[PDB]
């Protein structure tokens, strides 16, 4: 019972020493292909598990740091999880304040909590394990529970044998033994020893991190083939065409259909299209293509024909960033040789061409440093005076505020709004606009306010009603697999009461079903 004490007792955090002091060769380590070798491997492992489900692959993110505490890190219970205690801990936990968590600090905290017990489940073991090994040594020759020179060499010979290089002249060794004893002690305390195993699990992690980044057994050759067996089999084997490629990242799905292409000189696409049924075609299909690349084949879709599909228009034009568009805008000259904003202008009017095409030039300026207080009030009272105040609605005015701000200055811009006006900015749309133009305007704004509930809120309208939109579904869950999608969920279970796996499991059924569930990530 301790959660209470878990986002405080984390001291002032303060790889360089790692490969300097005592520096294993690189060609060593590289031309490198046990208990506590074990954890080490465990405490690195885990932390990539998820720090590479969304954005950057390499730091763990608000929802991707909940999801590991939940899942891996049990042992503390408590009242179950939290909000404010947890984002304190998060934020104890970001020495760096880049909002994310990196290895670095990821250490900081294991360090931290094997101080504290010093006194899945298989994280919670390699911490027992530290401990029993340290503990093992440390209660032997000298001082109780307190690592001597002599039970330190022991416990570093057989324990971490690995680690030592093939020769080990006794000048080296107690070159390491007194860079240990950063104390002055001339033993080890249990600090020194978790300082110890962070340098270890850094220098692991450069490794891993970087080059070579196929640690994780990632031969694109080797899944190639088992596709193409999966593909010449009886019936095929969709199932391992699944299992594999919708758990690959996009770029390592790329790496994949390249490496197919260079075997059997059929691009991968063209394979499983010619091999595959209906929506786990469509699913599989939209997995190859990049993001870029899907973003505007959808677009193109929306555009491509007699009428608009408005909604899928709306939906990636108002959930993509300046980033984002700019990729997309460029793919799409590429692919279709002809410009996004030319088929947007030339497949919808007035003033929602208007909005699509000011949205789609991926302008949005920056979210900046400072709060323009001034401009947020001004800006909430102009959204006033141009919709619910006049006879009629300034569309130009709405434009314009909601396309060029930033996105939080424009979520503070919508609180103050609601200061001048008795109905909220969504219901203010509703009353002052019809249509298209309502339907973008309330996008945009869900989009601004809160992204993951926005797409929770589409998944829940695809899957509720008699069947599935499963076009929209799909086009979700792949487009946001590697993005939001762990935030995407906690939105959906808090809204609905269900796990979004629950509702993809009810709606959907076969190998489809599991690879939504798949690109899902797991239940809640
Ligand atoms: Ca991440
Ligand atoms: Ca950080
Ligand atoms: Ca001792
Ligand atoms: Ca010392
Ligand atoms: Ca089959
Ligand atoms: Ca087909
Ligand atoms: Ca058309
Ligand atoms: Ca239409
Ligand atoms: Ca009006
Ligand atoms: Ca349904």
């Given at each position: 019972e301790?959660?209470?004490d878990?986002?405080?007792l984390?001291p002032?955090?303060?790889?360089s020493?790692?490969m300097?002091?005592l520096m294993?060769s690189?060609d060593d380590?590289?031309?490198?292909f ?6 080490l491997?465990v405490?690195?492992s885990?932390?990539h598990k ?7 692959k390499f730091?763990?993110?608000?929802s991707?740091?909940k999801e590991?505490?939940?899942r891996?890190?049990?042992?503390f219970?408590?009242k179950?999880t ?5 984002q304190k801990?998060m934020?104890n936990?970001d020495?760096?304040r880049?909002?994310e968590?990196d290895f670095?600090?990821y250490?900081v ?7 504290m017990?010093?006194?899945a489940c298989?994280l919670?073991?390699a911490?027992d ?8 040594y440390?209660?032997?020759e000298?001082?109780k529970?307190?690592?001597n020179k002599?039970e330190?060499k022991?416990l570093?010979?057989r ?13 080296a ?10 104390n002055?002690?001339?033993?080890v305390?249990?600090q ?5 195993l962070?340098?270890?699990?850094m220098m692991?992690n450069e490794?891993?991190?970087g080059?070579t980044?196929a640690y ?7 899944d190639?083939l ?6 010449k089999t ?13 758990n690959?990242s996009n ?8 490496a197919?292409?260079?075997r ?8 499983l299209?010619?091999?595959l049924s209906g929506?786990?075609?469509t699913?599989?299909?939209?997995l ?6 899907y ?7 929306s ?14 034009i108002?959930?993509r ?7 997309i ?8 040789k002809?410009?996004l904003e030319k088929?947007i202008?030339?497949?919808?009017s007035?003033?929602?061409?208007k909005?699509?095409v ?11 440093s400072?709060?323009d207080?001034?401009?947020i009030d001004?800006?909430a ?5 141009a919709?619910v105040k006049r ?11 909601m396309?060029?701000?930033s ?5 503070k811009v919508?609180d ?5 006006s ?6 203010s ?9 309502e ?21 829940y ?37 269900k796990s979004?796996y ?9 190998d489809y079903q599991?690879?939504?569930?798949y690109?899902?990530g797991?239940?809640?």
């Open positions: 301790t959660f209470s878990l986002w405080k984390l002032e955090n303060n790889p020493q790692a300097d002091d294993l690189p380590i590289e031309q490198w046990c208990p506590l070798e074990k954890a491997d405490m690195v885990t932390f998820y720090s590479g489900k969304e954005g950057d730091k763990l993110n608000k991707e740091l590991l505490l939940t891996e890190l049990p042992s219970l408590g179950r939290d909000e404010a205690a947890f801990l934020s936990l020495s760096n880049d909002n968590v670095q600090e250490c905290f294991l360090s931290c909590i094997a101080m017990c010093n006194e298989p919670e073991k911490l394990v530290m401990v029993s090994t340290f503990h093992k440390s209660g032997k000298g001082d529970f307190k690592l002599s330190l022991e570093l010979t324990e971490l044998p690995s680690f030592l290089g093939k020769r080990t002249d006794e000048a060794f107690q070159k390491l033994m007194s860079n240990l004893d950063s002055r002690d001339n033993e305390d249990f020194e020893y978790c300082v110890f962070s340098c270890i699990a692991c490794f891993f991190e080059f980044s994780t057994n990632f031969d694109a050759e080797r190639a088992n596709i193409e067996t999966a593909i009886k019936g095929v084997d969709e199932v391992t065409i699944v299992n594999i490629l919708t690959r770029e390592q799905r790329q790496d994949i259909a390249f197919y292409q260079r059997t000189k059929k691009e991968l696409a063209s394979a299209k010619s091999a929506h786990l075609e699913v599989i299909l939209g190859l293509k990049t993001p870029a690349q973003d505007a084949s959808e677009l193109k879709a555009m491509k024909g007699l009428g608009t599909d408005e909604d899928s228009l709306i939906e990636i108002c959930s960033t300046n980033q984002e568009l700019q990729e805008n460029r793919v799409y000259k590429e692919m279709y002809t410009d088929d202008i030339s497949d919808t007035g003033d929602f061409r909005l699509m000011a949205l789609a030039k991926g302008r949005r300026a920056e979210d900046g400072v709060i207080y001034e401009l001004q800006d009272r102009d959204l006033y005076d919709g006879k009629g609605t300034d569309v130009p005015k709405w434009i314009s505020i396309t060029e701000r996105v939080p200055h424009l979520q919508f103050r709004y609601k200061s001048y008795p109905y909220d900015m969504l219901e749309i509703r009353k002052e606009v019809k249509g298209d133009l339907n973008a305007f309330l996008n945009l704004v869900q989009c601004i306010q809160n992204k993951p509930l926005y797409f929770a809120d589409r998944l309208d695809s899957m509720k009603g008699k069947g599935t939109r499963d076009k929209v579904l799909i086009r979700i869950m792949v487009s946001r697999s590697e993005v939001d999608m762990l935030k995407i969920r906690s939105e959906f279970k808090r809204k609905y009461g979004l629950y509702y993809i499991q009810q709606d959907t059924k076969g599991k690879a939504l569930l690109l899902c797991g239940d809640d």
